[PDB]
Design a binder for this molecule. Sequence first.
Ligand code: HEM
Ligand SMILES: C[C@H]1CC[C@H](C(=O)N[C@H](Cc2c[nH]c3ccccc23)C(=O)Nc2ccncc2)CC1
Length: 409
Amino acid sequence: SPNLPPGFDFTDPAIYAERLPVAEFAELRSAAPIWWNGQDPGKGGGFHDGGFWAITKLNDVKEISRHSDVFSSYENGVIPRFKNDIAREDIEVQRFVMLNMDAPHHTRLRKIISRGFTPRAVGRLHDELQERAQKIAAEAAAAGSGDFVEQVSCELPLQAIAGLLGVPQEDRGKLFHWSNEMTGNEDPEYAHIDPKASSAELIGYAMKMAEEKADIVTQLIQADIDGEKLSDDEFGFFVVMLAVAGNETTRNSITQGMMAFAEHPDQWELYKKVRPETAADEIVRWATPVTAFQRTALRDYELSGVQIKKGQRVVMFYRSANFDEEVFQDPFTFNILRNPNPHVGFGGTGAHYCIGANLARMTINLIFNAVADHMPDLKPISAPERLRSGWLNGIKHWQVDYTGRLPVA
Ligand code: HEM
Ligand SMILES: C[C@H]1CC[C@H](C(=O)N[C@H](Cc2c[nH]c3ccccc23)C(=O)Nc2ccncc2)CC1
């Protein structure tokens, strides 16, 4: 029996609006590393199956991620929490993007799309993203103080997506406005936003992009050496998946990496001098922007002595796995030189491992270089405001003094 409150649910958005449940994950790793998280009827975040297995250890997250024949992404999608009254069809519509497909459909799409994430493809974005990062940090520093999320974290992930796709400069504002409405949450600050309508507008825009382009886009829509290509429709769903996979994730890694530097000033001093490229992985481990994704067992499977049954969901808590005391040396220390760094912030190794990981790391290293260049003495003004979501670990706002000159308490 682990020591938790009765009825505790690790996917409860009301927890994450205030804090990460770090103590509770540490209790599970220690005492019940695979634990049945029951959910009362009508309180399952859109799932009506009585609860899920909480997976808290890094080795178990890797084993589930490897065995995608047993642990399905398609069956229930991979997001483990929606509003409790969501219609089943709105969970199943996720199946149109590759993250929520199984083999064979997933395998074909992943092989085709991997073309867009070659070393050359990602490297071709470096210089424009470096220039853009420099101006973002300089403009924020010139403002003196402001919301770090909006003025520092937000723009570069969006420009990385826009650059990868070759989106015309004049269309970036509208693309960014759709993208910022599309990853749903349950936060009252965004309750009036409709993610469906924006997703639909982005699909239309992308299908036309495919029509007109007829960089990475040409490669994806033309037959490759094994004869495969995206239809315009599949290209539309590919663009939607980038808009949701690569926006708030990287953005939250930037905000929480800065929050870590503020908490660990010796690491920030070391970073500013040395700018180690290993920093990006430690920032992703520390930030764990996706707290959890799930799978559904398609057959009975014994996982580390626990008998998972056909049809049951398993929720991989990357936030727990990334602090696994058996894997990391002193996981509760932020160490920008950590190497190796076998974190699962981009997933456990397997078929769905984040295809954007190198682009995310480049975006993170470029923005931190620019922050070091333009605002080396930044200090926070007030505590971060966290996002109400049961699976995304988000920071909505964080007021900072970029100059470090204002008085602090
Ligand atoms: C720090 C930022 C990021 C984090 C933490 C993150 C995390 C993840 C995770 C956890 C998964 C699922 C892995 C699995 O199920 O094993 C994933 C998949 C994916 N990510 Fe990322 N990601 C980030 C940035 C990006 C970026 C910048 C892009 C592209 C612009 C991107 C594109 C994708 C795509 C297309 C998938 C689906 C892959 C598949 O299903 O085969 N991600 N990411
Ligand atoms: C046409 C169809 C609409 C649903 C799209 C989708 O799956 N969006 C969901 C959030 C979500 C889940 N169910 C939905 C229903 C409507 C609108 C949004 C959602 C989403 O934001 N997913 C996500 C996955 C990985 N990383 C970050 C975010 C894929 C394309």
